[PDB]
Design a protein around this ligand. Structure first.
Ligand SMILES: COc1cc2c(cc1OC)[C@H]1CC(=O)[C@H](CC(C)C)CN1CC2
Length: 386
């Protein structure tokens, strides 16, 4: 009866991602007080901060779960996430909003690394692990799909402080379940010590598996903060777009994540990721020819699809490689996965702008595209000798 544990991770990934998306319709409210890709720095400093902290706290957890087990960290991540929500409920200043974003990120990392660790440690059969993760990655898409709509409508219809408090209730409810299934009472270590991080980072077959996740995420991040939505002006026609502009990413991501998780193992898992990167590159190369906001609807759909097509396939491969070559402790490797997932958001907002100053912003897209395709063929060396 391991399935129920999986359920927990699903929630741990849904609510966590609902909070970051929920603040989307509230960002312009206290932000103010001709090209389509005008860049804003105030949003940029809001996008990286959370990740800039999550990247720092990612490795420190990988060792921790080797000494005090998986449950306790998860519980801590819940607690922190609740605190963050509360801080949000009374956050009235931009600085205070940045402080809440930092703690949130901490909690996020805790949940992501510990959850995945356990989720790989419980499902030891390779195909099973594959599909289970392919399911657990869906929670990210659901959080991206529900957090922007759920909030906006309620905020205006009921109250400015409603969308946090109500959501906080669910978080509190979630805590109850964590106390019934995980039982963080007794702290115990693992059986055998894990492989030192250095050693893993000295391996090419892991480096690639981390580069594949970084490139695609880096491309999507370089686009998100530079959108006409954040621009607050009376000349703006309507805010209907705000709260739905993140649909074409999440809707495509859920299908790709649950449709290849069981399918990739049928074909070559190496083949699934290659085509993924190539299709993400093709979709990004059409972003320059937008000329209108609706012109961004077609690319993002593919973008997200391919993102899923990569993440579903790459996430298990990390655990399979550690089992085939190193000690069977999964706590540290997935930490690497997570940092490879986050670096794109950690470095996008600044570098992007810097290039936008050097050359035109469409030129930046024409570059991050080609690199992706250039990185595509070397996913062939995914078959491993040991
Ligand atoms: C307002 O803050 C944030 C807003 C958003 C994101 C991050 C934010 O903060 C880092 C990412 C999250 C995903 O994983 C999404 C990945 C999709 C491709 C599935 C993309 N987007 C959405 C919006």
């Amino acid at each position: 009866s391991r399935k129920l544990i999986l359920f927990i991770v699903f929630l741990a990934l849904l609510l966590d991602n609902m909070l970051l998306t929920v603040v989307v319709p509230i960002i312009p409210s206290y932000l103010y007080s001709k090209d389509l890709l005008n860049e804003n720095v105030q949003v940029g400093l809001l996008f990286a901060s959370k990740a800039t902290v999550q990247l720092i706290t990612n490795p420190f957890i990988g060792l921790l779960t080797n000494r005090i087990g998986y449950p306790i960290p998860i519980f801590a991540g819940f607690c922190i996430m609740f605190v963050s929500t509360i801080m949000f409920a009374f956050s009235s200043s931009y600085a205070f909003l940045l402080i809440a974003r930092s703690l949130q990120g901490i909690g996020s990392s805790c949940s992501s690394v510990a959850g995945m660790g356990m989720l790989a440690s419980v499902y030891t059969d390779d195909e099973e692990r594959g599909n289970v993760m392919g399911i657990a990655l869906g929670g990210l898409a659901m959080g991206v799909l529900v957090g922007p709509p759920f909030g906006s409508v309620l905020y205006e219809f009921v109250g400015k402080t409603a969308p946090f408090l109500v959501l906080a209730a669910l978080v509190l409810l979630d805590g109850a379940i964590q106390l019934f299934v995980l039982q963080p009472s007794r702290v115990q270590p693992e059986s055998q010590k894990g492989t030192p991080l250095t050693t893993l980072l000295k391996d090419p077959y892991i480096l690639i598996a981390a580069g594949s996740i970084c490139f695609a995420n880096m491309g999507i991040a370089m686009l998100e903060p530079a959108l006409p939505i954040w621009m607050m002006e009376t000349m703006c026609s309507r805010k209907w777009q705000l709260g739905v502009a993140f649909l074409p990413a999440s809707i495509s991501y859920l299908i790709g994540t649950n449709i290849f998780g069981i399918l990739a193992h049928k074909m070559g898992r190496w083949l699934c990721a290659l085509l993924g990167m190539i299709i993400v590159g093709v979709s990004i190369l059409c972003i320059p020819f937008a000329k209108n906001i609706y012109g961004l609807i077609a690319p993002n759909f593919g973008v997200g699809f391919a993102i899923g097509m990569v993440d579903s396939s790459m996430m298990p491969i990390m655990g399979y490689l550690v089992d085939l070559r190193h000690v069977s402790v999964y706590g540290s490797v997935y930490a690497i996965a997570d940092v490879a997932f986050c670096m794109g958001y950690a470095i996008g907002p600044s570098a992007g702008g810097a290039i936008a100053k050097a050359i035109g912003f469409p030129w930046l897209m024409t570059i991050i595209g080609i690199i992706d395709i250039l990185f595509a063929p070397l996913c062939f060396f995914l078959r491993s000798p040991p």
